[PDB]
Amino acid sequence: STGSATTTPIDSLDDAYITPVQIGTPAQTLNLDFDTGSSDLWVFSSETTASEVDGQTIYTPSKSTTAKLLSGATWSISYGDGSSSSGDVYTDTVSVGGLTVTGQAVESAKKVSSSFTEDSTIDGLLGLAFSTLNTVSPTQQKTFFDNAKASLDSPVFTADLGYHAPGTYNFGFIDTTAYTGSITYTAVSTKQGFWEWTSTGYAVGSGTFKSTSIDGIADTGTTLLYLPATVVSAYWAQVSGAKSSSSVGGYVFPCSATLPSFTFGVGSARIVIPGDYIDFGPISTGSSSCFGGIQSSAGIGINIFGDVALKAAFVVFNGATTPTLGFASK
Numbered sequence: 001s002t003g004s005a006t007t008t009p010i011d012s013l014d015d016a017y018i019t020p021v022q023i024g025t026p027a028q029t030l031n032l033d034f035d036t037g038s039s040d041l042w043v044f045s046s047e048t049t050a051s052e053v054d055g056q057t058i059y060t061p062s063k064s065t066t067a068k069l070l071s072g073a074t075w076s077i078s079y080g081d082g083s084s085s086s087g088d089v090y091t092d093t094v095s096v097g098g099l100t101v102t103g104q105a106v107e108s109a110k111k112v113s114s115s116f117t118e119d120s121t122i123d124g125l126l127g128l129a130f131s132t133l134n135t136v137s138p139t140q141q142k143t144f145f146d147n148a149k150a151s152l153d154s155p156v157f158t159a160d161l162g163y164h165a166p167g168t169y170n171f172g173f174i175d176t177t178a179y180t181g182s183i184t185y186t187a188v189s190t191k192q193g194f195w196e197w198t199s200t201g202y203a204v205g206s207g208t209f210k211s212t213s214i215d216g217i218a219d220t221g222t223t224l225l226y227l228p229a230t231v232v233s234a235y236w237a238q239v240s241g242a243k244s245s246s247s248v249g250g251y252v253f254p255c256s257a258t259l260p261s262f263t264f265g266v267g268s269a270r271i272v273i274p275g276d277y278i279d280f281g282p283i284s285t286g287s288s289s290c291f292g293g294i295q296s297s298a299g300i301g302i303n304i305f306g307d308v309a310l311k312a313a314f315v316v317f318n319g320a321t322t323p324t325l326g327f328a329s330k
């Protein structure tokens, strides 16, 4: 079996991507943010504090005939964002682009942080990291990918995010039509439960490639690209007027400047991120200062290859017995 769904940016800056998901019977369609950095499938619902919902589409378990409450089960999640959500759990049928999974854990939100309430275009999240990260207790739950694995033609899923355009999420197969050249696979570490890999180095613009090991995680749930201070400094030094602002909390640059591309290494292969992808617009409406798409990870504790880097390639998440990450140009 297979599945394929279209993913769309929530705004003109590609802050996040939403993908339609069918939950329950009859089907209740909600637009979820596919997160390969988390392992929980939560959605705004009829249980969510009325004051905490502002325009989102909610899931009403009572209206689904396949919905069943998982007695005593609760959940609580926190994001690197400072974001948080919690509530109860139900089991229901979930379908993504034609691929159906029965008995999937659907975490119903009773409480949602302000950040979420503010985002009217996101109805919930669908975690695609490893199940060891699930926050359901006392009994931990498996992710949607984990539940489909068995039925997939291949235990894989691909990420093809678009730049200021719609993209695709495929389950069970590799569209050899979506990329150019060959796919370069790299080893993945599951120790921390993330799609953790090691990049072989980087290059700034037409500059010489620097061979250095960069351990980070492929996270579709993160907007930007977070790298070590040394690397980030080398990139920004090439942009006239660019500088780190303590008030803004990151590197900013004159909106009129032209950004150089950024190259990251994958084995002997190289993925080039056009400078256009790094521009995050005016820090504030009307401002002549723009926010950079490449920031330091000094305060995060881990390097993150977010949407900024991921959208520049065709990404294969091989969930085989020995997980691997595949990268290809497109």
Ligand SMILES: CC[C@H](C)[C@H](NC(=O)[C@H](C)NC(=O)[C@@H](CCSC)NC[C@@H](N)Cc1ccccc1)C(=O)O
Binding pocket: 033, 035, 036, 037, 038, 039, 078, 079, 080, 081, 083, 125, 133, 219, 220, 221, 222, 302, 304
């Ligand atoms: C960063 C530290 C937090 C607290 C950590 N949580 C995590 O690692 C969770 C699973 N994953 C995440 O926080 C991140 C992974 C990067 S750091 C590990 N997943 C992407 C994420 N931004 C989800 C999101 C999407 C839209 C809006 C907001 C947030 C924890 O449990 O300790």
